[PDB]
Amino acid sequence: STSQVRQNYHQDSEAAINRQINLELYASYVYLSMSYYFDRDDVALKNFAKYFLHQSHEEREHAEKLMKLQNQRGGRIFLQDIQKPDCDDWESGLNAMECALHLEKNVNQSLLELHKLATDKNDPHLCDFIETHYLNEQVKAIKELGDHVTNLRKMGAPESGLAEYLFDKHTLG
Template sequence: MTTASSSQVRQNYHQDSEAAINLQINLELYASHIYLSMSYYFDRDDVALKNFAKYFLHQSREERERAEKLMKLQNQRGGRIFLQHIQKPDHDDWERGLYAMACALHLEKCVNQSLMELPKLQVKSIKELGDHVTNLCKVGPWTGVGQVPLCPPAFQHISRYF
């Protein structure tokens, strides 16, 4: 693996956020791969469930497009994209429509859970930055040891409590 060069546009983009977006990209691509497998299973001449094939092909495209949007976001933020190997589906034979739909439901819940974790990462970063600002306001200009000449106006209401 080559070392990524530093970005000229990266600003306030924590490495944990970058890594989480990369994980999500890879999960979306994995889901797309699973749906593609399902689609072409149901398209086979011995299965011939065309509407299932069409539905799963549509799902595959949606997952891939979501991955592409995340890759675009990663580049816009100055992050680096690290694609992983896409794991082969556990099944090549999706048996019946009900079984495939149950697998798809489980897959969507996994993708959704992963998406729900992303804001938690951001909340952690916001809390960390807020704590830093609060601590800097505590040692504000009246003590002579503050790092800034005065607490930013947006945070003055915080400093009066300390």
């Protein structure tokens, strides 16, 4: 049953990629939830909605790239349930940005664990794949979210609704 393409690809690596696929699809779904929260008539921050929807689509592309890697290496994709996000109501633009920062750090920690596994199993193709396609993207996403959280807090969010309004217009618009 070994794939004719499989070479230097450990079962532990294959299993870790399947876990990462699920985590990327989960992240996609959290961002989708946040997007449509900001589209509510009683929230009405269109640029927050657009920002999170773009993040949702990016996470789905990240999941699909891992699925392509699994097939390239001769692993087998096993999909799992995509859990519902932890909240239905994300409270404010600042609370959503803080939850996004927490989610991106969690994804990053998973990627760092996968890199460590690839290095331990002497799988340099997999380690390079993670470095090239995932680790700098996560560092940039974390820095961007931290920048957004800083600005919203300085402007007086979430107490001032003027803060979120102007951030929506000037930063996310």
